[PDB]
Write a protein that binds this ligand. Structure first.
Ligand code: F37
Ligand code: F37
Ligand code: ZN
Ligand code: ZN
Lengths: 203, 208
């Protein structure tokens, strides 16, 4: 089903996805333990992820949700990082992609902060870091994030210090952090862009 | 200078800290008024607090106390709840964090019962409860406690009915004399005598 199409760096679509990726980088309270130390990325590639059957699975679920929420899908574009980005662009999101111990309750997690999703590229907590150097802050190995179309519908607003289709994990302390979100059905997200980058060591 | 490092639920360090939380829940004489009604917590996250500077400030004070007490720091792990948990992990403890009207005197209070420290998450007596529902028994909103390394030194034993250190003492141990299920509470006078080692984020859990 799945084909990847390169966006040229000169394409406006490449440029708006890049800018979203760069501009939603923030400092993390772990000092970069999980995701490494950086303020921006070297963007290597941006690919549109085209799969007709996964896309129809998304629009169909989107429909159902809009119709349970006064015609409002409450659709966002959000980041997702995972060691399973390959399975996801081929087979779609599903239960095995759910973060069981997630801070806002078991489900599939998405972030407004690209740098938050970056923390999960090598697994929970950055796991053991890159597979080549075991370096969570590796500046050499290439990473991927997905920039995804997510249907939130009626979102349960949860604060950190049934009748809902998602949870919004609002930040409270950390007046720097953006929102995180959780869906319970894989069909409510579609992995539209695949972004290959390095994190860049600061000056 | 503070960094917070997540511990994994599979880490035995995570597990020891959680069990310390859970196993020290008790009934309170307020029926849950200040801290809410619960028998256990839902632990969302445990982070180690790393800050090289506050840590040296802690150990320098501990050595002093230890020496003044015949080489016994009398160091414990104790809970602390406070609306200012975020400041404390950055700045450490100082006299801003002293409960002036505390039962065992003006100073900085620590509990062996996690549920006792939980009564202070939203202020003394639980203030007006969570910032969003104004509900002191809120089962939805996230709370944080600190589990801290605390130097007692020579501790003055004070019995209860339930500023400046006492004469040549480095702390007070407050021991409830009526209720023997209640565990001890402690007071220090110097912020440097405590280090916030873990930050635990949790919800109290509704019982059935
Ligand atoms: C590796 C895996 C997992 C866990 C969490 C995340 C993840 N968690 C997040 C939490 C907050 C914000 C973003 C993310 C995010 O982009 N990704 C990704 C994959 N853990 C798991 O049980 N299934 C997964 O797919
Ligand atoms: C809010 C504040 C305060 C007062 C009491 C407590 C507190 N009091 C306790 C008393 C007994 C046992 C534990 C605690 C405990 O964990 N925390 C914490 C903060 N009052 C204050 O003057 N400074 C504070 O930080
Ligand atoms: Zn590497
Ligand atoms: Zn609340």
């Amino acid at each position: 089903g799945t084909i990847l199409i390169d966006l040229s760096p000169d394409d406006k679509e490449f440029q708006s996805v890049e800018e979203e990726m760069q501009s939603t980088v923030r400092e993390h309270r772990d000092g970069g333990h999980a995701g490494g130390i950086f303020n921006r990325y070297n963007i290597l590639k941006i690919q549109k992820v085209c799969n007709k059957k996964l896309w129809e699975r998304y629009t169909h679920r989107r429909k159902e949700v809009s119709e349970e929420n006064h015609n409002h899908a409450n659709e966002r574009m959000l980041f997702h990082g995972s060691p399973f980005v390959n399975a996801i662009i081929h087979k779609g999101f599903d239960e095995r992609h759910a973060y069981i111990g997630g801070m806002f309750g078991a489900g599939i997690y998405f972030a407004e902060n690209s740098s938050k999703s970056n923390q999960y590229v090598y697994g929970i907590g950055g796991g053991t870091g890159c597979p080549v150097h075991k370096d969570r802050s590796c500046y050499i190995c290439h990473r991927q994030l997905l920039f995804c179309r997510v249907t939130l519908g009626k979102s349960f607003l949860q604060f950190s210090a049934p009748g809902h289709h998602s949870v919004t994990g609002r930040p409270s302390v950390n007046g720097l952090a953006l929102a995180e979100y959780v869906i319970y059905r894989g069909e409510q997200a579609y992995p539209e862009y695949l972004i290959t980058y390095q994190i860049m060591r600061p000056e």
